[PDB]
């Protein structure tokens, strides 16, 4: 499952719903794999077709850097992610948000 704090999940959950609610978002990486260290980032795949609009991207990075989370949120763009890498993410992930 997702090794983050309750309070941290809701912070993430709020930011995603206000800035990219038309996007499905998956957590992957060491935090879904039980191997999380204190300052491990949180890897999030932003799922869509076409590369995330720059502006909404910026605003996401802004919102996460402004928040109280004690580690970094590492955004991955599914649309420009290669198939080999997509296949590895699909082995193990946690859904955070689906497109409404
Ligand atoms: Zn990571
Ligand atoms: Zn990584
Ligand atoms: Zn990372
Ligand atoms: Zn990255
Ligand atoms: Zn494939």
Closest CA to 89 of 42, 41, 27: 27
DSSP letter, residue 38 = T
DSSP 62: H
* Contact predicate 66/14, CB 8 Å: no
1-100 fold:
Beta Polymerase; domain 2 (3.30.460)
- Resolution in Å, one decimal place: 1.8
How far, in Å, from the CA of 41 to the mean position of ligand 3?
Answer: 6
Question: What is the 14 CA–ligand 3 centroid distance (Å)?
Answer: 21
84 is catalytic: no
How many angstroms is it from 47 CA to the middle of ligand 3? Answer: 16
Q: Tell me whether residue 77 is one of the annotated catalytic residues.
A: no
CA distance 67 to 20: 16
Classified as helix, coil or strand, 43 is strand
Task: Give helix 54-66 / helix 6-19 axis angle, nearest 10°.
Answer: 150
**Torsion sign over Cα 20, 24, 29, 30:** positive
């Amino acid at each position: 499952q997702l090794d983050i704090k309750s309070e941290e999940l809701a912070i993430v959950k709020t930011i995603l719903q206000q800035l990219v609610p038309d996007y499905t978002v998956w957590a992957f990486g060491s935090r879904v794999k039980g191997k999380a260290k204190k300052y491990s980032d949180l890897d999030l795949a932003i799922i869509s077709e076409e590369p995330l609009d720059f502006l909404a991207r910026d605003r996401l990075k802004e919102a996460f850097s402004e928040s109280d989370l004690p580690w970094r949120v590492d955004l991955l763009d599914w649309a420009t992610t290669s198939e080999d890498f997509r296949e590895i993410i699909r082995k193990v992930y946690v859904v955070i948000q689906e497109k409404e």
